[PDB]
């Protein structure tokens, strides 16, 4: 689960793309933010795409 803070928990419906984390062995997939019960990240301005965050005003 990528980024700072997350809203995920037991029974969260979730979407996953592949791609592993080097240091976290066994972990071979990534949770895609802003989809299903995965939140995007609040207060994220740069790279919003990679973090499922909508644009500010």
């Amino acid at each position: 689960i990528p980024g700072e803070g997350h809203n995920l928990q037991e029974h969260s419906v979730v979407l996953i793309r592949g791609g592993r984390v080097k240091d976290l062995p066994g972990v071979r997939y990534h949770i895609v933010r802003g989809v299903y019960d995965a939140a995007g990240v609040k207060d994220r301005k740069k790279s919003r795409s990679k973090y499922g965050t909508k644009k500010p005003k």
Partner: peptide, 9 residues
């Protein structure tokens, strides 16, 4: 609290 207020709405 900010990360908290995203973990719990």
């Amino acid at each position: 609290l900010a990360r908290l207020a995203e973990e719990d709405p």
